[PDB]
Amino acid sequence: KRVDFCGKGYHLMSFPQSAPHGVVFLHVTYVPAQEKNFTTAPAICHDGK
Amino acid sequence: EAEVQIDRLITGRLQSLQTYVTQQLIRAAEIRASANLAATKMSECVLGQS
Numbered sequence: 001k002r003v004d005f006c007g008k009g010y011h012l013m014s015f016p017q018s019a020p021h022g023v024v025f026l027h028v029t030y031v032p033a034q035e036k037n038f039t040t041a042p043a044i045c046h047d048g049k
Numbered sequence: 050e051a052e053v054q055i056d057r058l059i060t061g062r063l064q065s066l067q068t069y070v071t072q073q074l075i076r077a078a079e080i081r082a083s084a085n086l087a088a089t090k091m092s093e094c095v096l097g098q099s
C-alpha cells in the first residue's frame with residue numbers, strides 16, 4: 001500500500017529472478033489513462049436534507 | 050645524507066593524508082543512509098498518505 005515502493009503506480013504483484021550476485025524483481029503495475037472533465041458537486045439537497 | 054631525513058617527512062604526510070581519506074569515507078557512508086530515509090519519507094508522505 002505504501003506508494004512508489006515496488007513499481008511506479010498502483011502495485012499488483014511481483015516475481016523474483018536470480019542473478020550472478022543479486023536478485024531481479026519484475027513488478028506488475030496498473031496505470032490509468034483516457035480521462036475526461038465532467039462536473040461535480042459536494043452533496044445533494046432534497047426536501048431540506 | 051638528508052634524503053633519509055626527507056623520508057620521514059614523506060611518510061608523515063602520507064599517513065596524515067591516509068587518516069583524512071578514511072575519515073571522509075566513514076563520514077560520507079552515513080549521509081547516504083540519512084538521505085535514503087529522506088527520499089523514502091518524501092515519496093510517501095508527500096505523493097500520498099501514510
Ligand SMILES: *[C@@H]1O[C@H](CO)[C@@H](O[C@@H]2O[C@H](CO)[C@@H](O)[C@H](O)[C@H]2NC(C)=O)[C@H](O)[C@H]1NC(C)=O
Pocket residue numbers: 035036037
Ligand atoms: C477539460 O477542460 C479544460 C478546459 O476547458 C481543458 O484544458 C484546456 O485544453 C485545451 C486543449 O487545446 C488547451 O488549449 C487549454 O490550454 C487547456 N486549458 C488550460 C487552462 O490549460 C481540458 O483539455 C479538458 N479535458 C479534456 C480531457 O478534454
